Design a protein around this ligand. Sequence first.
Ligand SMILES: CC(C)CCC[C@@H](C)[C@H]1CC[C@H]2[C@@H]3CC=C4C[C@@H](O)CC[C@]4(C)[C@H]3CC[C@]12C
Ligand SMILES: CC(C)CCC[C@@H](C)[C@H]1CC[C@H]2[C@@H]3CC=C4C[C@@H](O)CC[C@]4(C)[C@H]3CC[C@]12C
Lengths: 164, 164
Amino acid sequence: LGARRGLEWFLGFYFLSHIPITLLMDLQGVLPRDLYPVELRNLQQWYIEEFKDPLLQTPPAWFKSFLFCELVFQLPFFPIAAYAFFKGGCKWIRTPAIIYSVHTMTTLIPILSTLLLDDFSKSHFRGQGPKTFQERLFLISVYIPYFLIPLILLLFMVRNPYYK
Amino acid sequence: LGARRGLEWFLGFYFLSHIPITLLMDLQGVLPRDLYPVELRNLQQWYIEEFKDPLLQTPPAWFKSFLFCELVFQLPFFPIAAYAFFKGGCKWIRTPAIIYSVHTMTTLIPILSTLLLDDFSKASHFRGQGPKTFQERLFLISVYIPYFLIPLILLLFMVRNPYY
Ligand SMILES: CC(C)CCC[C@@H](C)[C@H]1CC[C@H]2[C@@H]3CC=C4C[C@@H](O)CC[C@]4(C)[C@H]3CC[C@]12C
Ligand SMILES: CC(C)CCC[C@@H](C)[C@H]1CC[C@H]2[C@@H]3CC=C4C[C@@H](O)CC[C@]4(C)[C@H]3CC[C@]12C
């Protein structure tokens, strides 16, 4: 297969896998914890205590607004985009995918900037976040693919003549 | 004048007016104070004192990241967009305007949510700097509202207009 067809397969698996990541992990900061079983509640508690995540446990107002945007705007677009790139040749996904890419990239620039430069001392984060530079890379590692893959998607829909 | 050409003239002045607004006011939270004369530095303090803006006074990491994007991406795009909408028939601006609109519409959803839902008392990390009453919150939101609605008008205009 081609690099174009392979990238469409990758984008489909990215949009297909983003549905359980959002419903079962990300939305635990904006949706009540009662709706989640003790297994998933404690699984997110593992990531927060091991990766030293400051945002997921007690989301600030700016991070909660992005999680609601992920619920109302991104989650419905995931199955639509998954079908579009799994099937192939869906010219109608260009503008919707560009809007998703710029939106998602804009949400993670402040996320990556906070993890890399903000103060997580016993600050309004109250020592929840990372202290060392190595612990910050462990956190940026989980968040960075959700900026690069939309970046690839933005460049892919702007120039590909098969979607114009 | 028609409806489409009238909206293009309105969009031209919006991008033209944002060049001094970004330069002489917003970028004072990222650029050194010595790059600005004493007169302009008090003009921003006059705004922070009267409108009680907690973000432009001392920018948090998430708000400062959006300001760096306004310098590297938005500011170079303003003179290009003003010319294209003043001249008319510049179909090459469709995708760049969509990218600007979605990006600008994503930076303010956290801003608008923070100014209306977050606490700015002395018990918070803002240390008592910011709006207190609901009227003071809408008085500050009023300044940031046009920069979410005007891009939204631009987004819907670029998507459906057959001339672009
Ligand atoms: C135990 C394991 C599975 C925990 C996994 C943590 C990762 C996969 C979760 C936790 C925080 C989540 C992020 C929270 C916020 C956003 C911003 C949104 O606009 C894009 C998705 C994105 C970037 C989420 C991607 C998935 C994410 C990084
Ligand atoms: C005296 C009057 C005219 C002053 C007007 C101040 C207004 C126009 C300025 C002050 C604060 C500015 C905002 C500061 C931050 C950003 C985030 C950036 O990503 C988009 C532009 C945006 C949203 C600016 C829009 C213009 C803005 C709202």
